[PDB]
Amino acid sequence: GGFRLIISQELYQVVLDHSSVNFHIPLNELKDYIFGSIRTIDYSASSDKIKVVKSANIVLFTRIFYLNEKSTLRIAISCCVTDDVLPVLTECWPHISSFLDQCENTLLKYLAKNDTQFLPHDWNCIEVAAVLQTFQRKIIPLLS
């Protein structure tokens, strides 16, 4: 089914932006949905958010995490899908959350490899490709 995968981080920089052939919305509106709220408490911790972009019939789910204990900078793995996937997305969430964990581990290992705090924006980066592949082969198929 169609999807848009954005990997981004705070310094905001977009590392990957991939829409499926099958599949939008402005990048500045997304930065706000991803890193933008007075309804949720900000804990400075690793988390998951699901938001409905009413203006586009889309649901956005985001894993956001820190490089490490000492860091104040966030990395986000965000995905847009049709809002009618929300029932399946919520039914299958323990599966999706576990796959997002692997994606989070993968990007963190890149940072460890390169002793850096920054993902490339011109990614032969196998770690970024591995995340795209996890969405293509595991997450999105489960959401049909």
Author numbering: 9 to 19, 28 to 39, 44 to 56, 58 to 144, 148 to 168
What does the published report state?
Flcn is also known to have two paralogous binding partners, the Flcn interacting partners Fnip1 and Fnip2, which interact independently with Flcn. This Flcn/Fnip (either Flcn/Fnip1 or Flcn/Fnip2) complex has been recently reported to be involved in amino acid sensing through regulation of the Rag GTPases at the lysosomal membrane and therefore controlling signalling through mTORC1. With the motivation to understand more about the Flcn/Fnip complex, we sought to investigate their putative yeast orthologues Lst7 and Lst4. We solved the structure of the Lst4 longin domain, thereby confirming it as a bona fide member of the DENN family. Additionally, we show that Lst4 interacts with Lst7, not through its longin domain but through its DENN domain, and we demonstrate that the Lst7/Lst4 complex exists as a 1 : 1 heterodimer.
In order to overcome this, the Lst4 longin domain from Kluyveromyces lactis, a closely related budding yeast, was expressed, purified and crystallized. The K. lactis longin domain (aa 58–226) crystallized in the P42212 space group with four molecules in the asymmetric unit (AU). The final structure was determined at 2.14 Å resolution by molecular replacement of a higher resolution native dataset. Several loops were missing in the electron density, between β1–β2, β2–α1 and α1–β3, in addition to nine residues at the N-terminus and 13 residues at the C-terminus, most likely owing to their inherent flexibility. The structure reveals the classical architecture of a longin domain, which is the first domain of the complete DENN module. The domain is made up of a core five-strand β-sheet, with one short α-helix (α1) traversing the face of the concave side and the longer α2 and α3 packed against the convex side. An entirely novel feature, which is not present in any other previously determined longin domain structure, is the kinked helical extension to α2. ConSurf analysis of the structure identified two conserved surface regions of the Lst4 longin domain, which were mapped onto a surface representation of the Lst4 longin structure. The first patch (P1) mainly comprises residues from α1 and several that lie on the loop that precedes β3. The four molecules seen in the crystal structure do not represent a biologically relevant assembly, as an analytical ultracentrifugation experiment indicated that the protein was monomeric in solution.
